[PDB]
Amino acid sequence: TQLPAGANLALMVQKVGASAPAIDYHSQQMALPASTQKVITALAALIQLGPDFRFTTTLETKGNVENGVLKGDLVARFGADPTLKRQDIRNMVATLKKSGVNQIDGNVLIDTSIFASHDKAPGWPWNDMTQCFSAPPAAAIVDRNCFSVSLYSAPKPGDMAFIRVASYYPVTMFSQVRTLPRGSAEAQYCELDVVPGDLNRFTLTGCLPQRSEPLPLAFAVQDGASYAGAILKYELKQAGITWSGTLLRQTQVNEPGTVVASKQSAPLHDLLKIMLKKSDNMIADTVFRMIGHARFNVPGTWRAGSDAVRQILRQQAGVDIGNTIIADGSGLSRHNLIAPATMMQVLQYIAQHDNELNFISMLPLAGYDGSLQYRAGLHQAGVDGKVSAKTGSLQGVYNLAGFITTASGQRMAFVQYLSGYAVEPADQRNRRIPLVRFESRLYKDIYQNN
């Protein structure tokens, strides 16, 4: 129990298939799940979409092709594939050319109709939206909608710091950054900021102290449709395909044209494995809106995703999540709220159906992979290779949800929702001892005593 001052612990530990818990500490109390939400996303995804689902992107033609000229529109139909790469667009364009299209007497349509409404879930902090871990998981993703930039201080203080960016990234960078002399009075409270604008404009503002080396930065693309469009436009031009119209967005549901090129992701089981092992927000959130699209046959939205996951858990898994709030697939949202006792029902379902789902093998294994390769507390408890669990991690939050095989060989499911492991400013970069000692004793206890 003895953690630092002010932290909030809800904890439940329960033998697989048992009706009573071994440990029950505030298990009914709802908490922020953070990335442990991905356990629920993966279960709902496997039930709704199946392990063999693949994300799809196509180039389609609407119109007849006469002497190499398409009389009509080229449609690039995006499908929320989180693994789509620039190369993939290049290869699809190569295929289009090879099929005999040299020219489009028409428009080039960037079709995102698979999804609708905002590409950002309710409850996501605005300030993180330009960080790649929170890049809007839109229908149109290329290279994870994340790009990098180099910021160089100016040789002469007072002059503008300047930005280098690879020419192939269709973004527009502006610097309003003032370079500060060493010892400037401004260093303390002058911030270095990124301000996103329309059409993938970014302005860097504020101050940068002199440095000998450039500062590397990575940012999230805010308008994936425009970004993918510019990549497509560039690849069309390089392949020698001309067009008379313009690049337009297509957002309304429409009958497919003739598929001339396509790309499918790896199978969903493989993607869910990456997601659980590495805690991939983008895979979780593209999956989440896909679940709603599939279940209700409507463009995927956050609301449809939430409704669908609740229905799938109740109807296929027998889990009534009650007053649980599910806002997204990744757990980014500060709106997500769930009790250890509700997550426990999910974990029990997974364990009972694990031979069907092949689910537990996707979770990080303590001491081997993903997020638990070295978790000090688990290592020190002597439980490496005995815990398969999903982390939920952000400032002051140390959640864990999954399974442990005990000294007697009994498998137990557990949920540790721990937050407010906040520290005073003067110790903010050190916060470890109590957690590690707590986890070491706890999982040692659970392991040895069960």
Ligand SMILES: *C(=O)[C@@H](NC(=O)[C@H](N)c1ccccc1)[C@@H]1N[C@@H](C(=O)O)C(C)(C)S1
């Ligand atoms: C799940 O809890 C996710 N956490 C976040 O997105 C946090 N906003 C965050 C924490 C630290 C750094 C950047 C973002 C995922 N789990 C994290 C983890 O496993 O450490 C993550 C960084 C891979 S994102």
